[PDB]
Amino acid sequence: PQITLWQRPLVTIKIGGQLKEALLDTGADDTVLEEMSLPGRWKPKMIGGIGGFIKVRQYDQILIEICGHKAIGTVLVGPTPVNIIGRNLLTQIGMTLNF
Amino acid sequence: PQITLWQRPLVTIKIGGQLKEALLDTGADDTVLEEMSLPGRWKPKMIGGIGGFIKVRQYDQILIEICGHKAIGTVLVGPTPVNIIGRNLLTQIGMTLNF
């Protein structure tokens, strides 16, 4: 389907058993979510944007269900002000920008 | 046209008669550009990002071309890591998300 941008393109994802409201973000290389527990090993990382950088934990090969698809990708967990779905996952579900 | 998301959706914009590279950002409500000169008076605006809040200069009814499409709207100028085209302008050029 088509999602307009009149309002923030929010979606509900299902990850690690939990449901979270997230933002389909083409300006984000990676998916960044608020503090939560995830399985597997992780690597510390620093990601920056407007306002500076925040320290996050990087988890790979994470299953996430978005827009009816079960995509696999990297998830950065940390003190982000809003849950963000980055290009790393958007590509997996075949999402594109059109005009 | 269609833009996939395997790479950053960087496009050429024209503002103040100059060409610049900007990121089509569905996660941004507003368009924020790197330090530059714009005509007229500006108003103050506080915007929040992943790393915190920053102060930006708000200019209204500014002409800006994005991917060859002409738009006239609000442009914020401040300490952003890269030029970002927010929803205020993405909507002006008929940009949407599709899957």
Ligand SMILES: CCOP(=O)(COc1ccc(C[C@H](NC(=O)O[C@H]2CO[C@H]3OCC[C@H]32)[C@H](O)CN(CC(C)C)S(=O)(=O)c2ccc(OC)cc2)cc1)OCC
């Ligand atoms: C202090 C926070 O206050 P807040 O109001 C704002 O909360 C956010 C934070 C980040 C984003 C995504 C970025 N949009 C944003 O900053 O938007 C700005 C401009 O429009 C305004 O409206 C939304 C917040 C202003 C942008 O799309 C992605 N950034 C990357 C890019 C600018 C280079 S990013 O989030 O820093 C990022 C993501 C993934 C990465 O992996 C490598 C790296 C970096 C949206 C909303 O929340 C209060 C509860």
